[PDB]
Amino acid sequence: STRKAVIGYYFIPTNQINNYTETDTSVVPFPVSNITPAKAKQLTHINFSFLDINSNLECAWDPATNDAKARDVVNRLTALKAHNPSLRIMFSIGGWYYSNDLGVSHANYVNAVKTPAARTKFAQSCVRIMKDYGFDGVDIDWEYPQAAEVDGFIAALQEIRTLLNQQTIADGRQALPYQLTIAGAGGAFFLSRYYSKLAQIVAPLDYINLMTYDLAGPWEKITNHQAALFGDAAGPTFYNALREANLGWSWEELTRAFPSPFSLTVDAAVQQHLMMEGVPSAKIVMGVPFYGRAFKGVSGGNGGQYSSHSTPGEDPYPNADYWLVGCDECVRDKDPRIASYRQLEQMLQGNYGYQRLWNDKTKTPYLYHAQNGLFVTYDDAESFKYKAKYIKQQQLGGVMFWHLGQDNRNGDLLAALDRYFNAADYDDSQLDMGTGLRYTGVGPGNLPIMTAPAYVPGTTYAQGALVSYQGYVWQTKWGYITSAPGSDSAWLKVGRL
Ligand SMILES: CNC(=O)NC(=N)NCCC[C@H](NC(=O)C[N-][N+]#N)C(=O)N(Cc1ccccc1)Cc1ccccc1
């Protein structure tokens, strides 16, 4: 029954708002009018981005924003709701530029959530902005609160939730209640900052939208897929930072939940969330990229995968060599390292020297330019079949993507996602999910159903013996054990009845 969420970011920089126009793509490449009624029907949420937190510790527009122009842009988005009574226009606070550890507004994020009074003032500003501009909910994209700030962040979400609920009552919006989401880490290293308190983070949210992309980039030594669904044993692996989180678990519990090293994949991030007690699968949304990440200086042999590379990691892109052959948008944006799916289609179609290759373990496409040594990791309508099937099988809440302007003109990526979830005639029952590496971790939140003989008092159990007892299946960690399962540290809870 329940419709999967389809959450698309609409990003527009301040300069484009201030010069907003729907008839000049060299000024605004992707105006609201490109979101046609058909696209609007295929979305459940549009996340308008980005607002910020100012030094007054309130949610605010960038202060250079022309306010009349901003209201006009937002009004155009909310007018889309005429075509889809399920559709919400959220607004997002944060993003990497504003909120990263070294970002321009970082201290405002830290300070806004720091004390009860600050949280109240911040929470109020969020709901006030929401009402003033006509938004339908609040998305927080702070990348990322550090373990010490996590309790404040949690209390801030709780308080926003209460104020949103009041507003839903005041406006009689029970048919479309005001919502709260966050953009969550999609890889273990950032996730470990708040992982131990994941259940408290998710409780106040309608959805946690996993940034399950940007898992490879120029900061890594070796090229890799940025959003592999499953792992490739030929690919790099990473230290599992979650095993060092402050969980209070035992060695066996830690080891069973957090294999290490592990493959940095979409399935890993999803499973890591599901392992936590009190994190329901319906609130987890899988992010996907509508862009590819490009690398230069790559060697041959494996289509450019898992190769050293000479891609600058600095920001801004440090020179004017725009080496991603055929990428016109790269020239416009002065950066050959990111290419929209829209542009990648054109690069494939023109005489630019790319081959489209497919990794059947990761279930993702990549471009390889044999002559110049280039590699591009991206997603398309094919990789989205496997991802949508995974979303259905794991009973996730839906899909999120960055960003709407990166789909092709016909919006084929959005239309594919919508089709995989909702088309009566689409059938993926035979879609083969392949033999790529699954994240095998098990934690208190995802115990498999098991059976085993009932525990018998007085029996001496050898190491590895399985019994059932009080709702669960238990395994001895050593032998010989005679204690009742769960009464001391000799038994590992491994499954549920
Ligand atoms: C909804 N929120 C998000 O999707 N957030 C998000 N992806 N955060 C990760 C940000 C890292 C940043 N990513 C991109 O630029 C992806 N863009 N697209 N499409 C990133 O790669 N870098 C940090 C950065 C980005 C922009 C401005 C300053 C810093 C490093 C980088 C390396 C190579 C090219 C571009 C950026």
Distance CA 73, CA 256 (A): 50
DSSP 3-state of 371: coil
List the one residue out of 356, 383, 363 whose CA is nearest residue 435: 363
User: Measured over all CA atoms, what is the biggest interatomic distance in the chain, rounded to whole angstroms?
Assistant: 82
Q: Say whether 377 counts as a known binding-site residue.
A: no
- DSSP per position, 159-180: HHHHHHHHHHHHTT-TTS--EE
- The sheet with strand 472-476 has its strands ordered as 466-469, 472-476, 491-496
- Contact yes or no for 441/271 (Cβ under 8 A): yes
Domain boundary among 355, 379, 403: 379
Strand 5-11 and strand 398-402: pairing? parallel
Check if 182 has its Cβ closer than 6 Å to any atom of ligand 1: no
- Contact yes or no for 401/415 (Cβ under 8 A): no
Radius of gyration for the alpha carbons in the chain, expressed in angstroms and rounded: 24
- DSSP per position, 105-139: THHHHHHHTSSHHHHHHHHHHHHHHHHHHT-SEEE
Strand 472-476 and strand 137-141: pairing? unpaired
Distance CA 393, CA 354 (A): 34
**CATH number for the domain harbouring residue 459:** 2.10.10.20
- In ligand 1, the atom with minimum distance to the C-alpha of 312 is 33
Distance CA 104, CA 26 (A): 27
- Contact yes or no for 338/349 (Cβ under 8 A): no
What spacing in Å lies between the alpha carbon of 217 and ligand 1's midpoint?
Answer: 9
- Contact yes or no for 258/343 (Cβ under 8 A): no
Residues 320 and 207 in one domain: no
- In ligand 1, the atom with minimum distance to the C-alpha of 211 is 4
Long-range pairs, 19-25, Cβ under 8 A, ≥24: 20/69, 20/72, 20/73
List the one residue out of 198, 218, 242 whose CA is nearest residue 374: 218
- Contact yes or no for 195/245 (Cβ under 8 A): yes
For the chain, the residues before each gap (C–N > 2.5 Å) are none
Residues 399 and 470 in one domain: no
Distance CA 197, CA 157 (A): 13
Distance CA 16, CA 100 (A): 23
- DSSP per position, 293-349: EEE-S--SSSTTTT--------SS--SS---STT-HHHHHTT-TTEEEHHHHHHHHH
Number of domains in the chain: 3
Angle between the 67-79 and 116-133 helix axes, to the nearest 10 degrees? 70
486: alpha, beta or left? (left if phi > 0; alpha if psi -120 to 50): left
Q: Say whether 364 counts as a known binding-site residue.
A: no
DSSP state of 148: G
Residues 172 and 317 in one domain: no
DSSP state of 399: E
Distance CA 261, CA 15 (A): 44
Distance CA 246, CA 249 (A): 8
Residue with CA nearest ligand 1 atom 17: 338
- DSSP per position, 244-290: GSS----HHHHHHH--SSB---HHHHHHHHHTSTT--GGGEEEEEES
Q: Say whether 212 counts as a known binding-site residue.
A: yes
Technique used to solve these coordinates: X-ray
DSSP state of 447: P
Cα-based angle 105, 111, 113 (whole degrees, multiple of 5) = 110
Burial of 30 (0-12, 13-18, 19+ CB in 10 A): buried
- Contact yes or no for 313/218 (Cβ under 8 A): yes
- DSSP per position, 41-105: HH-SEEEEEEEEE-TTSSEE--TT--HHHHHHHHHHHHHGGGG-TT-EEEEEEE-HHHHSTTSTT
Q: How many CA atoms lie within 13 A of 227 on its CB side?
A: 29
- In ligand 1, the atom with minimum distance to the C-alpha of 209 is 1
How many other CB atoms are found less than 10 A from the CB of residue 472? 18
Torsion of CA 459, 461, 466, 472, to 10 degrees: 60
Distance CA 254, CA 246 (A): 11
Q: Bridge-partner residues for 356, per DSSP?
A: 367
Pocket test for ligand 1, best of 96, 207, 407 (most atoms within 8 A of CB): 96
Residues 436 and 453 in one domain: no
Domain boundary among 415, 431, 447: 447
Can you read off the two tokens belonging to residue 284?
């987890």
Distances (CA, A) of 299 to 83, 91, 302, 365: 49, 42, 8, 18
What spacing in Å lies between the alpha carbon of 111 and ligand 1's midpoint?
Answer: 24
Residues 215 and 122 in one domain: yes
Can you read off the two tokens belonging to residue 314?
């600095």
Q: Say whether 94 counts as a known binding-site residue.
A: yes
Pocket test for ligand 1, best of 214, 311, 342, 403 (most atoms within 8 A of CB): 214
Domain boundary among 344, 379, 414: 379
Residue with CA nearest ligand 1 atom 2: 95
Q: How many CA atoms lie within 13 A of 378 on its CB side?
A: 29
Residues 184 and 206 in one domain: yes
Residues 224 and 173 in one domain: yes
Distance CA 348, CA 374 (A): 13
Residues 284 and 352 in one domain: no
Sequence-distant (≥ 6) Cβ neighbours of residue 495 within 8 angstroms = 447, 448, 449, 450, 452, 472, 473
**CATH number for the domain harbouring residue 366:** 3.10.50.10
Long-range pairs, 344-351, Cβ under 8 A, ≥24: 344/292, 344/376, 344/378, 345/408, 350/326
Residues 283 and 340 in one domain: no
Sign of CA dihedral 416, 419, 421, 427: negative
Residue with CA nearest ligand 1 atom 18: 338
Distance CA 181, CA 7 (A): 11
Given 58, 143, 149, 159, the catalytic residue:
143
Check if 389 has its Cβ closer than 6 Å to any atom of ligand 1: no
- Contact yes or no for 16/27 (Cβ under 8 A): yes
Strand 364-369 and strand 355-359: pairing? antiparallel
DSSP 3-state of 474: strand
471: alpha, beta or left? (left if phi > 0; alpha if psi -120 to 50): left
Task: Determine the structural domain holding residue 456 and report its residue range.
Answer: 448-497
Q: Say whether 168 counts as a known binding-site residue.
A: no
Residue with CA nearest ligand 1 atom 15: 338
**CATH number for the domain harbouring residue 37:** 3.20.20.80
Burial of 427 (0-12, 13-18, 19+ CB in 10 A): exposed
Residue with CA nearest ligand 1 atom 9: 96
Check if 337 has its Cβ closer than 6 Å to any atom of ligand 1: yes
Residues 89 and 152 in one domain: yes
Residues 190 and 316 in one domain: no
* Residues comprising the chain, all counted: 497
- Does 143 qualify as catalytic in the annotation? yes
List the one residue out of 382, 410, 401 whose CA is nearest residue 43: 401
Sequence-distant (≥ 6) Cβ neighbours of residue 347 within 8 angstroms = 324, 325, 326, 327, 339, 354, 367
Residues 461 and 330 in one domain: no
Strand 284-289 and strand 398-402: pairing? parallel
Q: How many CA atoms lie within 13 A of 72 on its CB side?
A: 14
Sequence-distant (≥ 6) Cβ neighbours of residue 5 within 8 angstroms = 44, 45, 207, 285, 397, 398, 399, 400
- Contact yes or no for 205/177 (Cβ under 8 A): no
Residue with CA nearest ligand 1 atom 12: 96
- Structure-token match 């200086």, residue found: 297
Q: How many CA atoms lie within 13 A of 409 on its CB side?
A: 5
Check if 276 has its Cβ closer than 6 Å to any atom of ligand 1: no
